[PDB]
Each structure stands twice: as structure tokens, then as C-alpha cells.
Write a protein that binds this ligand. Structure first.
Ligand SMILES: CNS(=O)(=O)c1ccccc1Cl
Ligand SMILES: CNS(=O)(=O)c1ccccc1Cl
Ligand SMILES: [Cl-]
Ligand SMILES: [Zn+2]
Ligand SMILES: [Zn+2]
Length: 571
């Protein structure tokens, strides 16, 4: 407690000694309060909006640009649950770490991430200026030697829920735990259940492969506030990755887990305006990319235990018998890898095809681990899916699409209002017309490679690419990102969907976009197309006028028409 978190608080208290007041009317119940001291909207992308006029009247799209679960506690699991988790976590770190060696990530790797503008969750006005200043690295090394001493001084979170930190503390986490993402621990090759690095164009093929396994329904239960339901027992099972480490790495990693995760300190603004300095032991508080890997790990653990419950491996969560323990251990060594293969897990998001539908009502371990299901009553059996093309995963569903030549594409899809509404939004200040145009181009190229099968998005993508100068490079201030490039989109399409695609045996290239199919006209409408509306027909007819409006605003530049690629603009 105060041994570990004190110095961090005491250092903050000193710097605001003239304004340090113990607020007696503090709203916290489950967070520990310590003291208080005196102390960013969505912006519309104009290029994308001018080329999507029909959507200017559609509520869902328009309203996307307009505009307390942290203060809950999580009961400690029973003895049987805690034993199931410890055994499963032990086994899972071994299976993951069999083909992978834990290592420290380097200043040089970290600096490359800041120079390439990667999201680290920092709070020198820029990351670039800090990694170039040798002073900072002296601050880092001071904390570093404090961590080797088993102590902490400057690793405090800043809730604004994304918890930001000073770049230093971010480096110390990346140095100790970055290997999990940097070395692809949660790849489908190393993990069997994971999809890390897969890409949207892979995920449908993966869920079709899971479908092929004999068993029951596909389950895709969402957890009600996953990050808030991470227990101290969860954090202790995650910490066992240090059992596979040695030297400066093992001790440094041990310090991230014990000083920053298993104990924390946070600064949250309250408008009554005072900064509160609060602490707690449990719940997920770490960088997004580490949080992704540890969420995947604990989700993989939880779903193997739910599978064990459905299969009758153990009878009660109250207490595991020594005989139950060896059976659990034997199930893992015998069938564990096959069971991990029956799942697709992306952080808190899962799809599970269990051995049979007993899984649907195997709820005692899942509820006792704190992973309570969203939108369903505590003890009501899960609703399963009887077709892989209906299963929700990573905010998508997936269609099976037949090319005129008989080859099979499995494509990603979601309601089209969501896609158009997101592409119309840009975050942050000081965007030039050129910067705004290059972000619109990034969305257009993504639609050409991921959503080419939606009539409205292939047309709007061709319009935006025709309105932005051909040689201007697509941008994104903040999954694979193959659409990010200046190469021909047809060349990239052929690479992604034909050349690289392990599910496509015939490698015969496509030589025209008209060889690339759409969903059925009725299916397109079901997934939110405006085909059949008068607004959409006038937009399609008159698209060159919209393109020319945006060209006139950007000015005299090198422009390439990409509308002739489509049959209806081809003479
Ligand atoms: C607007 N005409 S359409 O797109 O061909 C169509 C879509 C869905 C159901 C019936 C029809 Cl006719
Ligand atoms: C050529 N345009 S379109 O997207 O094929 C279409 C537009 C309006 C109604 C139905 C359809 Cl299919
Ligand atoms: Cl279904
Ligand atoms: Zn620290
Ligand atoms: Zn769809």
C-alpha cells in the first residue's frame, strides 16, 4: 500500500503544497482517495462530407459527429475458481512461450515508434523532442534504478477510459512487456485462438475455419465492462509471464506488474475544479497495446475454463479436489491446443465453437471470475449462432461472395451508416486542407480493399480518389493497414485477396475492377445501402460535379479520374 504508492503521492503533494486539501465531500467509494489540489470534440472531414451528400439527411451518420463504471468493485473468486485460473494460466504461458523467448525492447525500438507517430498514450510538447533530449533518458534511468530497487516515483496514470502517462513510464512498460506485441505472442500461429496481426481481410476466413470444426453453435458473448472486471487474481496470473524471464528483464517486468498494475495511483479532474489523487489494486490500468495482449491472454484463459465447465471436467467452483486438479491438468495437455483452435479472441472480444451446446448454460466459473455477460440475465443460457456469416466479431460480420470465375472471397462488412459516419470525422486541431484531403483518401482506399462489395462505398471511394491529387500520400495521425500506400489500388487488391491469400488456390490475377463482385442488391440494402433512393441516384448521376467542387477548393493540381473503372461511367 503506502510503502509502494506513497512516494508518487508525496512527490505530487510537495509540488502542490500551497493547494493540498483533503476534500470530505469526495465521490469515491471503491477507489482510495488521498488528496486534492487546484487545477476535444469530433471535427467534420469536409472532403468526405462534400462527396457523401445523400448522407447529410441520415440521422445515424449526422449524429455521430455531434456531442461511471470505474467506481465499482469485483468480489474475490471462490477457491475452486482461483485454482482453475492458476493451473490454466501456468499452462497457457508455457504453450505461448514454447516457440518465443521473452526479451527487453530497446530505446532504439521505442524512438522508431515516436518518430513514426505511434499511439503510446503519453502526456517537450512532443514525444519526438523528449527522445532527442538526453536529459529525459536520465529521468528514465533514475526511475529504472528505482524499479530495480523495487520502488516507484513518477509512474502515475492520468484519467481523461484512456489512462495516459509521462513518456518515461510508457518506455519502462514497453521495455519490460513490449515483446508481447513486438514478437507477436498473440499471433494465430503461436496462440491458436489469437488473431493479432491478422487483418480484417483474414478474420472472415478464420471464423469460416472455426465453423468447419464439429461441435455446437458459435457463441460470441460480450462482457459488460471487461477492463473494470479484471480482478487482482487476474493480474497475478498475468504476472506469471515473469517466470519465463531472467536477469534485468525478470526484475524490471516484476516491477511493472507490482508497482504500476497490482498497485496504482491516478489523477482525475473533478469540476466542483480540483485534481483527485486516487489509488486501487485491481481493474486494467496499462498502455493500450499491452492491455490488448493481457486482455487476449485472460480472455483465452476464461474461455478454456468455460469450455472445461461445459465438458464436465470439474463439478463445482467451490473447491477443486486433488483428483479434479490432475483431470484439469490432463485435459489441458491432452486437448488444450484443439480447444484453443475452436476460438477467435481479440482482447475482450471472442467467438467460441465448443464441443457441444452444454457450454451455453456453463455459467458458474464465468460469473465467479467476474466476466459477467452484457445484455442477458446472469443465469439465462447464452444465445448461439447457427451460421458463421451471422456471428459478430471485431464490430463486423462476414459474407461469402462468389466471383464470376467461381473463386470464393470471404469479406468484412458492417452497417454502412457506421462506415460513412466514421470517415466524416477527423480528430484534433490545425488540419490543413491537404491533411484533411489525405485522411479522406485513407478511408477511400480502405473502402476499396475491405468494402469494395458495397455499391455506395466503391463509388464514394472512386469519387474521393478522383477529387484528391493522385500523388498526395494518405495520412492518419492515429490490424494491418495495406490501404496506406500510393500504389495502384487494383495492384494492392490482387496482392491481398489473390497472391497472399492462403484460402485462394488459383492465383490468376484480376485485370479490371468490373471482375470484382458486389453483394446481392437486396443484401447490400439490408447492410444499409441507399441503392433505390432518388437522393442516391442523383448523387451517382452527377458525381463529376461533386468531384469538380472539391477539385476547385483544393486548386490546380494533378488529378486522375477513377470513375471510368466502374461499368456505368465507362461510355
Ligand atoms: C432499388 N432496386 S434494387 O436495388 O434492385 C432492389 C433492392 C432490394 C429489393 C428489391 C430491389 Cl428491386
Ligand atoms: C448502377 N447503380 S447500382 O448501384 O447498380 C443501383 C442503383 C439503383 C438501384 C439499384 C441498383 Cl443495383
Ligand atoms: Cl444464426
Ligand atoms: Zn515507476
Ligand atoms: Zn453485411
Amino acid at each position: 500500500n503506502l510503502d509502494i504508492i506513497g512516494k508518487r503521492i508525496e512527490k505530487i503533494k510537495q509540488e502542490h503544497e500551497t493547494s493540498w486539501h483533503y476534500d470530505q465531500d469526495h465521490p469515491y467509494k471503491t477507489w482510495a482517495y488521498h488528496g486534492s489540489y487546484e487545477t476535444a470534440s469530433s471535427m467534420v472531414n469536409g472532403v468526405v462530407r462534400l462527396l457523401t451528400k445523400p448522407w447529410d439527411i441520415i440521422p445515424m451518420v449526422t449524429q455521430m459527429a455531434m456531442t461511471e463504471k470505474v467506481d465499482t468493485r469485483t468480489q474475490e473468486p471462490k477457491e475452486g475458481t482461483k485454482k482453475l485460473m492458476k493451473i490454466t494460466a501456468e499452462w497457457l504461458w508455457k504453450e505461448l512461450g514454447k516457440k518465443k523467448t521473452p526479451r527487453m525492447c530497446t530505446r532504439e525500438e521505442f524512438t522508431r515508434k515516436v518518430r513514426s507517430n505511434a499511439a503510446l498514450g503519453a502526456i517537450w510538447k512532443s514525444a519526438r523532442e523528449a527522445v532527442e533530449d538526453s536529459g529525459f533518458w536520465e529521468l528514465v534511468d533514475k526511475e529504472r534504478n528505482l524499479h530495480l530497487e523495487g520502488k516507484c516515483e513518477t509512474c502515475v496514470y492520468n484519467m481523461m477510459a484512456i489512462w495516459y502517462m509521462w513518456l518515461g513510464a510508457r518506455f519502462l512498460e514497453f521495455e519490460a512487456l513490449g515483446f508481447l506485441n513486438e514478437d507477436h505472442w498473440f499471433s494465430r500461429e503461436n496462440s491458436l485462438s489469437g488473431v493479432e496481426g491478422e487483418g480484417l481481410h483474414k478474420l472472415g476466413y478464420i471464423l469460416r475455419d472455426v465453423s468447419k470444426k464439429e461441435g455446437g453453435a458459435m457463441y460470441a458473448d460480450d462482457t459488460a465492462g471487461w477492463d473494470t472486471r479484471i480482478t487482482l487474481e487476474d493480474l497475478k496470473n498475468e504476472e506469471m509471464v515473469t517466470n519465463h524471464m531472467e536477469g534485468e528483464h525478470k526484475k524490471l517486468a516484476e516491477a511493472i506488474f507490482k508497482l504500476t498494475y497490482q498497485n496504482k495511483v491516478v489523477r482525475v479532474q473533478r469540476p466542483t475544479t480540483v485534481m483527485d489523487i486516487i489509488s486501487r489494486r485491481d481493474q486494467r490500468g496499462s498502455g493500450q497495446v499491452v492491455t490488448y495482449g493481457l486482455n487476449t491472454f485472460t480472455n483465452m484463459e476464461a474461455q478454456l475454463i468455460r469450455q472445461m465447465e461445459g465438458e464436465g471436467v470439474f463439478k463445482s467452483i467451490q473447491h477443486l479436489t486433488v483428483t479434479e486438479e490432475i483431470a484439469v491438468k490432463n485435459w489441458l495437455v491432452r486437448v488444450g491446443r484443439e480447444r484453443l483452435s475452436r476460438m477467435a479472441i481479440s482482447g475482450d472480444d471472442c467467438v467460441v465453437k465448443p464441443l457441444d451446446d452444454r457450454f451455453a448454460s456453463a455459467l458458474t466459473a464465468l460469473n465467479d471470475m467476474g466476466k459477467v455477460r452484457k445484455d442477458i440475465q446472469q443465469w439465462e443460457p447464452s444465445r448461439g449462432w447457427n451460421d458463421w456469416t451471422q456471428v459478430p466479431f471485431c464490430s463486423h460480420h462476414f459474407h461469402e461472395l462468389i466471383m464470376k470465375d467461381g473463386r470464393v472471397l470471404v469479406v468484412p462488412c458492417r452497417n454502412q451508416d457506421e462506415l460513412i459516419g466514421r470517415a466524416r470525422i477527423s480528430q484534433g486541431a490545425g488540419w490543413s486542407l491537404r491533411e484533411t484531403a489525405c485522411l479522406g483518401k485513407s478511408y477511400a482506399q480502405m473502402w476499396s480493399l475491405m468494402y469494395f462489395h458495397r455499391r455506395d462505398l466503391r463509388l464514394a471511394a472512386n469519387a474521393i480518389c478522383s477529387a484528391v491529387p493522385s500523388h498526395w500520400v494518405p495520412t492518419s495521425r492515429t490490424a494491418t493497414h495495406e490501404w496506406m500506400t500510393t500504389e495502384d489500388m487494383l495492384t494492392v487488391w490482387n496482392r491481398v485477396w489473390i497472391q497472399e491469400n492462403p484460402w485462394m488456390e488459383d492465383k490468376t490475377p484480376v485485370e479490371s475492377w468490373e471482375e470484382i463482385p458486389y453483394l446481392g442488391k437486396r443484401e447490400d440494402q439490408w447492410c444499409g445501402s441507399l441503392i433505390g433512393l432518388t437522393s442516391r441516384a442523383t448523387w451517382a448521376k452527377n458525381i463529376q460535379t461533386a468531384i469538380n467542387q472539391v477539385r476547385s477548393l483544393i486548386g490546380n493540381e494533378e488529378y486522375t479520374d477513377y470513375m471510368p473503372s466502374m461499368k456505368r461511367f465507362r461510355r
